[PDB]
Design an enzyme around this catalytic site. Sequence first.
Site, short mmCIF file in Angstrom:
data_model
loop_
_atom_site.label_atom_id
_atom_site.label_comp_id
_atom_site.label_asym_id
_atom_site.label_seq_id
_atom_site.Cartn_x
_atom_site.Cartn_y
_atom_site.Cartn_z
N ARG A 293 -9.14 0.12 -4.13
CA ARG A 293 -7.96 -0.62 -3.63
C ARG A 293 -8.06 -1.96 -3.89
O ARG A 293 -8.90 -2.62 -3.55
CB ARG A 293 -7.77 -0.27 -2.03
CG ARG A 293 -6.98 -1.29 -1.24
CD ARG A 293 -5.52 -1.18 -2.04
NE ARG A 293 -4.85 -2.36 -1.39
CZ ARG A 293 -3.67 -2.49 -1.40
NH1 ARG A 293 -2.89 -1.80 -2.45
NH2 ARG A 293 -3.03 -3.50 -0.97
N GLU B 34 0.61 -1.20 0.03
CA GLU B 34 -0.07 -0.04 -0.04
C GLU B 34 0.91 1.32 0.00
O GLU B 34 0.36 2.33 0.58
CB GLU B 34 -0.91 -0.05 1.25
CG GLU B 34 -1.83 -1.22 1.18
CD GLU B 34 -2.77 -1.22 2.30
OE1 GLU B 34 -2.73 -1.44 3.47
OE2 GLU B 34 -3.82 -0.41 2.13
N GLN C 281 5.06 -6.71 -0.91
CA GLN C 281 4.94 -7.43 0.48
C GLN C 281 5.80 -8.43 0.74
O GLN C 281 6.42 -8.96 -0.18
CB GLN C 281 3.43 -7.65 0.56
CG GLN C 281 2.64 -6.62 0.74
CD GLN C 281 1.11 -7.18 0.58
OE1 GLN C 281 0.94 -8.39 0.66
NE2 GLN C 281 0.18 -6.21 0.03
N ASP D 268 4.92 -3.22 -12.62
CA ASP D 268 4.41 -3.00 -11.28
C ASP D 268 4.13 -4.20 -10.61
O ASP D 268 3.09 -5.15 -10.86
CB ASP D 268 3.03 -2.09 -11.22
CG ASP D 268 2.18 -2.17 -10.14
OD1 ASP D 268 2.94 -1.96 -9.21
OD2 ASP D 268 1.08 -2.12 -10.17
N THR E 13 -1.39 2.99 -7.86
CA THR E 13 -2.17 4.33 -7.90
C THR E 13 -1.08 5.34 -8.98
O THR E 13 -1.65 5.95 -9.76
CB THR E 13 -2.40 4.91 -6.97
OG1 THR E 13 -3.13 4.20 -5.95
CG2 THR E 13 -3.20 6.38 -6.91
N1 LIG Z 1 -4.83 9.69 0.06
C1 LIG Z 1 -4.12 9.21 -0.78
N2 LIG Z 1 -4.24 7.90 -1.06
C2 LIG Z 1 -3.34 7.20 -1.79
C3 LIG Z 1 -2.22 7.74 -2.35
N3 LIG Z 1 -1.43 6.83 -3.07
C4 LIG Z 1 -2.47 5.79 -3.07
N4 LIG Z 1 -3.52 5.70 -2.15
C5 LIG Z 1 -4.34 5.13 -1.88
O1 LIG Z 1 -3.84 4.08 -1.16
C6 LIG Z 1 -4.47 2.71 -1.66
C7 LIG Z 1 -3.24 1.62 -1.76
O2 LIG Z 1 -2.48 2.30 -2.94
P1 LIG Z 1 -2.10 1.18 -4.23
O3 LIG Z 1 -1.42 2.00 -5.14
O4 LIG Z 1 -3.19 0.22 -4.39
O5 LIG Z 1 -1.05 0.16 -3.29
P2 LIG Z 1 0.37 -0.69 -4.00
O6 LIG Z 1 0.06 -1.04 -5.36
O7 LIG Z 1 0.59 -1.49 -2.95
O8 LIG Z 1 1.36 0.59 -3.82
C8 LIG Z 1 -5.37 2.76 -2.68
O9 LIG Z 1 -6.64 2.68 -2.34
C9 LIG Z 1 -5.19 4.39 -2.94
O10 LIG Z 1 -6.08 5.06 -3.69
C10 LIG Z 1 -1.78 9.18 -1.90
O11 LIG Z 1 -0.83 9.81 -2.25
N5 LIG Z 1 -2.87 9.97 -1.12
F1 ALF Z 2 -1.25 -3.99 -3.27
AL1 ALF Z 2 0.25 -4.02 -3.00
F2 ALF Z 2 2.04 -3.85 -2.86
F3 ALF Z 2 -0.14 -3.96 -1.21
F4 ALF Z 2 0.44 -3.96 -4.70
MG LIG Z 3 0.06 -3.10 -6.39
#
Ligand SMILES: Nc1nc2c(ncn2[C@@H]2O[C@H](COP(=O)(O)OP(=O)(O)O)[C@@H](O)[C@H]2O)c(=O)[nH]1
Ligand code: ALF
Ligand SMILES: [Mg+2]
Length: 305
Positions: free
Chosen positions: A136, A10, A162, A158, A15
């Site tokens: 998410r 996360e 984890q 991407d 995003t």
């Molecule tokens: N408010 C806010 N939410 C964010 C930001 N970057 C990501 N998110 C939110 O945090 C959550 C997790 O991000 P995500 O990119 O899915 O995670 P990752 O793929 O594990 O890096 C998603 O629901 C996003 O919308 C940010 O800069 N600000």
């Molecule tokens: F959803 Al992740 F790293 F937590 F891509």
């Molecule tokens: Mg991801």
Amino acid sequence: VKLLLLGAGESGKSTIVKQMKICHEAGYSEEECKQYKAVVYSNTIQSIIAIIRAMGRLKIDFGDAARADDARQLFVLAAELAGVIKRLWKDSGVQACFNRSREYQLNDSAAYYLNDLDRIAQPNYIPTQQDVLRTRVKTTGIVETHFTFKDLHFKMFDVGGQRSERKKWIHCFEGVTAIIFCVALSDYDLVLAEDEEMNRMHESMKLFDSICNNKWFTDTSIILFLNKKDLFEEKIKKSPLTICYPEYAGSNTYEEAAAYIQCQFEDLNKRKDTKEIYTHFTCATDTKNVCFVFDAVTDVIIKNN
Ligand SMILES: Nc1nc2c(ncn2[C@@H]2O[C@H](COP(=O)(O)OP(=O)(O)O)[C@@H](O)[C@H]2O)c(=O)[nH]1
Ligand code: ALF
Ligand SMILES: [Mg+2]
């Protein structure tokens, strides 16, 4: 060009990808949004359900005893669902608990969705670009996306960030022009989801330190995105950076703390006098930003490459 989106769980990696399709491709078509309608509906519920399960664990009470029927019908249903969720979102008991969200797991976008509730709950609801950015979905494995820019064929990978996914990384290492390491600034006071006794940010510093100095990138540009600055800006105001850094002697200012977390990260850099770290602060759900910073990102690679 080959970019790698690495980070902890996360941190915002996925995003940032979505933002590439918006800045460099036409941002999500009305049907391409409708496809995320179910995920929105899904994030919202899980979001609200998390609070109510949290109150009972922290032994918190409602403000009105009419939250029994609401929270009860909310679990039974698992369209009055809207109103039921609405009433809950207002209640002082609910809100009072939403603040202590740090003590558990709650979707970052939780406040977002539940605040736009009426709009989101309309029959002909067609999610907006932002609604899709906010969603998410745990990334599992590796997602590839190819696109063009100022003439370069970009191949952005991407991956899931984890402890269980971090092993699938080594194969997307050799040929790699540069990598973007995303850090959730707002993770200073939270703990891992895989380990409750691990500061989310120290974990990131261990990962960064590991990637930043891994020999396969002696010539791979390292970009540091200190993501979630908007959430960081709202949290230092009521939480001390000392929770993460006990030595932190500075003030509880979004500006000072941010200029500590930054320095903290770049000092892990070995290959020090032979490698530079391109640090930025971002708000992954803000297209204006992601492109302003990415504009610089492409430029640096143009210099270095
Ligand atoms: N408010 C806010 N939410 C964010 C930001 N970057 C990501 N998110 C939110 O945090 C959550 C997790 O991000 P995500 O990119 O899915 O995670 P990752 O793929 O594990 O890096 C998603 O629901 C996003 O919308 C940010 O800069 N600000
Ligand atoms: F959803 Al992740 F790293 F937590 F891509
Ligand atoms: Mg991801």
